[PDB]
Paper text:
The free fatty acid receptor 2 (FFA2) is a G protein-coupled receptor (GPCR) that selectively recognizes short-chain fatty acids to regulate metabolic and immune functions. In humans, there are four FFA receptors (FFA1-FFA4); FFA1 and FFA4 specifically recognize long-chain fatty acids (LCFAs) with aliphatic tails of more than 14 carbons, whereas FFA2 and FFA3 are responsive to short-chain fatty acids (SCFAs) with aliphatic tails of 2–6 carbons. Expressed across various cell types, including immune cells, adipose tissue, intestinal epithelial and endocrine cells, and pancreatic β-cells, FFA2 plays a crucial role in regulating immune function, lipid metabolism, and the secretion of glucagon-like peptide 1 (GLP-1) and insulin through the activation of the Gi or Gq pathways. Here, we determine the cryo-electron microscopic (cryo-EM) structures of the human FFA2–Gi signaling complex simultaneously bound to TUG-1375 and 4-CMTB, as well as inactive FFA2 bound to GLPG0974.
Numbering used by the authors:
A (entry chain B): 4 to 340
B (entry chain A): 4 to 53, 182 to 232, 241 to 354
C (entry chain R): 3 to 151, 162 to 280
D (entry chain C): 8 to 63
E (entry chain D): 1 to 121, 124 to 235
């Protein structure tokens, strides 16, 4: 029916008018009298050497010391950051891995990729070896991202244009999040783990209610595929990173974009995005083989974490906020501080 | 000034390091191939000659080959094709009998997309033109002019064989960085593995010249 | 300052000023390549070569002093012994390491599969050590025999000529001709194979044979004249006067290697 | 297809129903949080070497 | 199901030789440093020898150095102790203990059942002042272990362990690195202390808690145990 298509357009117009109405002053205008952060001089403290292929993903533990990393070699390595020691090395059934996660408790790790399977690994056994606990199957497409809520719950994004919540014990999808019209690329839990946001190749980000299983809000602005997403520490905003070589800041309550982080010299897309503990810095990996640091309130470049030889694939900040880990296609993680 | 337990934890790290290096050496002594094709255009039959992803193993003349078929992966290629940046070669399959089945043009559209992909600048392509027997029976029935109206030559197998070959090789733009090895395979063959071996040998030589600095 | 000495004076300086930066640049590159995943045996040797070159380039200033002093040693005599020792030890360490690279180039193309299969970076290390053992070890024995008994080893007495000259000939035969015969054999077949293997583009075919020939000439133009002097010496039973000239050329290779191996690769 | 178009309409209704605050307020609240947690952030204000565990 | 069965014990004549064999089943024996710990008829525990994963590091006690030799056969999952020139001192039950060392591991976790050997006729001193203390089921008790040297390291790990040997059983790990409680241990057990002072506080005494409580340092080899405090009543 044509009416339905028209009625949709009328509602889209209404939403646009509503979000235009509450737009009164820009973040730039408010953040004019604050002083700049200065020049952010970070140096490489550690270089974690071991992977023999392009590193695709990494994730910190909650302890803010251990971190897991994933590579196309077909290995998860768990590092001790302080000592540059390898704690576990896990051989993977599929070498094609595009994501990995570390449980908050620190008892489990997850990974997945072109196998279309999220594999859970029990780290703490009596036998003293890391074994596969569960292989979660159901997704039709490549597993793009995964993040634990609990020891028994994990949420995954996949190229099949869906996100799914799992009950690890039973190994079944509890609820499926449907809405996107492109390969869902990145995922970010809210602090309270009651909501999460997902960025897809449809150049759109969506807010999900974990419990009810529905799209609460949809965010548009990016011109190209959103490759990275991360939640602001407050939990009332989030930052995306796309192929149009811009990062953007969205707030949930006003339901619109606030700030854009663009520089004319920068033309390559963003791989990865993360915030500082305060949320005053917004770190972003790029395809030009260097990470940049943005004043999240002013939108001025504050520093450059240049060091890697190849694409900065993944980027993570500790919970204590003490350090930054940057994995790359040069098969090295560098820990900055 | 390490403590007793710290030193033992280092010893463990070293053993992990050792076993990682060994697994790497083993991986380096293996040929990795990517298999692409317009639907089922003789990808199955050449696999016999030798779900997200399917992996095949075959050894020939003391050289192990790993062949990855990504047919089941029904998603935007651009978002994962960069994973296979570093494969030794790309085997491409085209059904020569699917010229009148448009599909040939779709195969051509897929071919040039892979050939002129930023990731596969210096990645050789081992094109197989499958189903030549049926094509020889098809050309005498239905002409090639349906597929290629610019084809002015006589509707014979020998001429059309060379013509279609030329079409695909013309799609290649980077003629210096990489090479294309073409072969007319069929269902009743036993020398297709040999043709891959010859082609891969050439790719190894080139990589050997890169390491020495000659190239 | 004689017009002869002036030329030797100028030559070393030019070799010092162009060689020393070129190596340091190439060293950074090679060191980096070893730390990266899956290094090759030839990458170990190329590192080893650059180090061997530097050692010579760092002891080259003392030879510049000589050329400025018009071949008269003023520094303590202990310096002469260490300076000269490290200089010649490096020449021969270079000679053998180049013969090492020539093999890895031949095997690369003669037996490509069997090269790939058995390409552990261990063998590269072994090959480098042999070059060090053969060169430094040969010199070490010699200098030990001396102490257990105005010119920095360029006015040997008539009595000494009955031990220095025999040893020089020994150094020529087993410490140059052996790594020469290898080098010539490898690069002869290498060129013959690259011009018989037709599954290639023409540009690479020429590029490869080009650099193959330039390397083989470098070897025979730089290290040739010095190792021939040894022979000339034994036949005449007298130290060749033109030895000082030959070392200039043997040094020139420390300047001409980094360009041929690293900078030519950067062009490609 | 008709049900799909209907489903889209239902989703858009829900997104239109939500209440929205002014940007000025949201802007101030992001600022306020970054002001309050300025001392906690190690990267914003480099910590002394003794505290830093990555010495190096 | 982790188990370590030892064998090769009996009556040996003095100055002889005997080999012990500790067969492993139900864990990755390859990736576990192994220890030997003796116990004389009516005395506390005494550490003997260690061999790391990879057999790349070995240590011995000073009483056995030269005489005893430790070795492992990873394929067959068996640990060996080749003893030579046996003395009337060596008469002891020999236990076979596993230990894994990485960040946040639990060393000395599982002990074997042991084997009885009978021979016919700079070290850190851990001190437990209380030899025995009577207790009432339901109450709380505290065990005290002192040290000669501060067991706190610069990294901030106080390497002090606690063990319990119930009557007619093998020692069981309770607490590792002063505070961290071991798996399969009730929360009633708790451990705290300083550099040299240590206290194991057991609450809600159970009838199964009766036994001897040892304290062991793991700051540096040789690894030294205390005398042991026996709970009773
Ligand atoms: C033996 C012996 N016994 O008395 C004497 C005198 C010798 C004796 C042997 C050989 C030489 C001699 O010329 N060498 C040696 C040398 C020279 C300089 C510094 C270090 C070294 Cl190793 S190796 C290179 C060669 C050269 O420079 O052409 C000179 C002297
Ligand atoms: C004989 C030629 C090929 C050779 C040569 O140009 N070498 C090169 N190395 C690096 C770049 S060009 C040469 C060696 C020695 C002298 Cl004195 C003159 C020429």
């Amino acid at each position: 029916l044509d009416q339905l298509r028209q009625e949709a357009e009328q509602l889209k117009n209404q939403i646009r008018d509503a979000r235009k109405a509450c737009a009164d002053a820009t973040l730039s205008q408010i953040t004019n009298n604050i002083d700049p952060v200065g020049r952010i001089q970070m140096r490489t403290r550690r270089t974690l050497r071991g992977h023999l292929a392009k590193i695709y993903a990494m994730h910190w533990g909650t302890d803010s010391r251990l971190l897991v990393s994933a590579s196309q070699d077909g290995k998860l390595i768990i590092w001790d950051s302080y000592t540059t020691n390898k704690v576990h090395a896990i051989p993977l059934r599929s070498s094609w891995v595009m994501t990995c996660a570390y449980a908050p408790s620190g008892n489990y790790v997850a990974c997945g990729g072109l196998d279309n399977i999220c594999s859970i690994y029990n780290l703490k056994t009596r036998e003293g070896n890391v074994r596969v606990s569960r292989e979660l199957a159901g997704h039709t497409g490549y597993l793009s991202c995964c993040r634990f809520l609990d020891d028994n719950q994990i949420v995954t994004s996949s190229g099949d244009t869906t996100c799914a919540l799992w009950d690890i014990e039973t190994g079944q999808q509890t609820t499926t999040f449907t809405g996107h019209t492109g390969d869902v690329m990145s995922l970010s839990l809210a602090p309270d783990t009651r909501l999460f946001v997902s960025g897809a190749c449809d150049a759109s980000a969506k807010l999900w209610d974990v419990r009810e299983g529905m799209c609460r809000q949809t965010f548009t602005g990016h011109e190209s595929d959103i490759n990275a997403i991360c939640f602001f520490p407050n939990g009332n905003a989030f930052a995306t990173g796309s192929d149009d070589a811009t990062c953007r800041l969205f707030d949930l309550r006003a339901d619109q974009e606030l700030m854009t982080y663009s520089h004319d010299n920068i033309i390559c897309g963003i791989t990865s995005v993360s915030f500082s503990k305060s949320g005053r810095l917004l770190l972003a990996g790029y395809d030009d083989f260097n990470c940049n640091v943005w004043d999240a309130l002013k939108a001025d470049r504050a520093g450059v974490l240049a060091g890697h030889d190849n694409r900065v694939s993944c980027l993570g900040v500790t919970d204590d906020g003490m350090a930054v880990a940057t994995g790359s296609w040069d098969s090295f993680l560098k820990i900055w501080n | 000034t390490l403590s007793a337990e710290d030193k033992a934890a280092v010893e463990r790290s070293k053993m992990i390091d050792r076993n990682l290096r060994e697994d790497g050496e083993k991986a380096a002594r293996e040929v990795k191939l990517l298999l692409l094709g317009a639907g089922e255009s003789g990808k199955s039959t050449i696999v016999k000659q030798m779900t997200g992803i399917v992996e095949t193993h075959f050894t020939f003349k003391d050289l192990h080959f790993k062949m990855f078929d990504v047919g089941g992966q029904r998603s935007e290629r651009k978002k994962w094709i960069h994973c296979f940046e570093g494969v030794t070669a790309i085997i491409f399959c085209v059904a020569l009998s699917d010229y009148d089945l448009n599909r040939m043009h779709e195969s051509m559209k897929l071919f040039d997309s892979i050939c002129n992909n930023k990731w596969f600048t210096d990645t050789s392509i081992i094109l197989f033109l499958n189903k030549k027997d049926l094509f020889e029976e098809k050309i005498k029935k239905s002409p090639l002019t349906i597929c290629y109206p610019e084809y002015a030559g006589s509707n014979t197998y020998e001429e059309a064989a060379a013509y279609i070959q030329c079409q695909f090789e013309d799609l290649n733009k980077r003629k210096d960085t990489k090479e294309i090895y073409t072969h007319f395979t069929c269902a009743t063959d036993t020398k297709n593995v040999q043709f891959v071996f010859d082609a891969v040998t050439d790719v190894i030589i080139k990589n050997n010249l890169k390491d020495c600095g000659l190239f | 300052p004689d017009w002869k000495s002036s030329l030797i004076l100028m030559a070393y300086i030019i070799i010092f000023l162009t060689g020393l930066p070129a190596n340091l640049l190439a060293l950074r590159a090679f060191v980096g390549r070893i730390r990266q995943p899956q290094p090759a045996p030839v990458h170990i040797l190329l590192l080893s070569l650059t180090l061997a070159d530097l050692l010579l380039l760092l002891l080259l200033p003392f030879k510049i002093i000589e050329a400025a002093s018009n071949f008269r040693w003023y520094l303590p005599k202990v310096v002469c012994a260490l300076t000269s020792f490290g200089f010649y030890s490096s020449i021969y360490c270079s000679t053998w390491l180049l013969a090492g690279i020539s093999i890895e180039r031949y095997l690369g193309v003669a037996f490509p599969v069997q090269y790939k299969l058995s390409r552990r970076p261990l063998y590269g290390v072994i090959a480098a050590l042999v070059a060090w053992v053969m060169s430094f070890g040969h010199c070490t024995i010699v200098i030990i025999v001396q102490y257990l008994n105005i010119t920095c080893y360029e006015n040997f007495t008539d009595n000494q000529l009955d031990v220095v000259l025999p040893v020089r000939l020994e150094l020529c035969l087993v410490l140059f001709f052996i790594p020469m015969a290898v080098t010539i054999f490898c690069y002869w077949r290498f060129v013959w194979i690259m011009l018989s293997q037709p599954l290639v583009g023409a540009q690479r075919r020429r590029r490869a044979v080009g650099l193959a020939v330039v390397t083989l000439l470098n070897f025979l133009v730089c290290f040739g004249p010095y190792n021939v002097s040894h022979l000339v010496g034994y036949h005449q039973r007298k130290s060749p006067w033109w030895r000082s000239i030959a070392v200039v050329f043997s040094s020139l290779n420390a300047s001409l290697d980094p360009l041929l191996f690293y900078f030519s690769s950067s062009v490609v | 297809s008709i049900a799909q178009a209907r489903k889209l309409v239902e989703q858009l209704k829900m997104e239109a129903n939500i209440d929205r605050i002014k940007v000025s307020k949201a802007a101030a609240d992001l600022m306020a949080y970054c002001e309050a947690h300025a001392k906690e952030d190690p990267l914003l204000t480099p910590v002394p070497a003794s505290e830093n565990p990555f010495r190096e | 199901d982790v188990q370590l069965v030892e064998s090769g014990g009996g009556l040996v004549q003095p100055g002889g030789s005997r080999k012990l064999s500790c067969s492993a089943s139900g864990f990755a024996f390859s990736s576990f440093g192994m220890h030997w710990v003796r116990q004389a008829p009516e005395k506390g525990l005494e550490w003997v020898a260690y061999i790391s994963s990879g057999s790349g590091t070995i240590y011995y006690a000073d009483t056995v150095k030269g005489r005893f030799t430790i070795s492992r056969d990873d394929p067959k999952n068996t640990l060996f102790l080749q003893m030579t020139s046996l003395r009337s001192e060596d008469t002891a039950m020999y236990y076979c203990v596993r230990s894994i060392y990485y960040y946040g591991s639990s060393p000395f976790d599982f002990w074997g059942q042991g084997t009885t050997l009978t021979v016919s006729s700079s070290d850190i001193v851990m001190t437990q002042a209380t030899s025995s203390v009577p207790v009432t089921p339901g109450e709380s008790v505290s065990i005290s272990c002192r040290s000669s040297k501060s067991l706190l390291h610069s990294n901030g790990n106080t390497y002090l362990y606690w063990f319990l040997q119930r009557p007619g059983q093998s020692p069981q790990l309770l607490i590792y690195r002063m505070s961290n409680l071991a798996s399969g241990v009730p929360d009633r057990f708790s451990g705290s202390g300083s550099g040299t002072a240590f206290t194991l506080t057991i609450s809600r005494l159970e009838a199964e808690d009766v036994g001897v409580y040892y304290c062991m340092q793991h700051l540096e080899y040789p690894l030294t145990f205390g005398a042991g405090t026996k709970l009773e009543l």
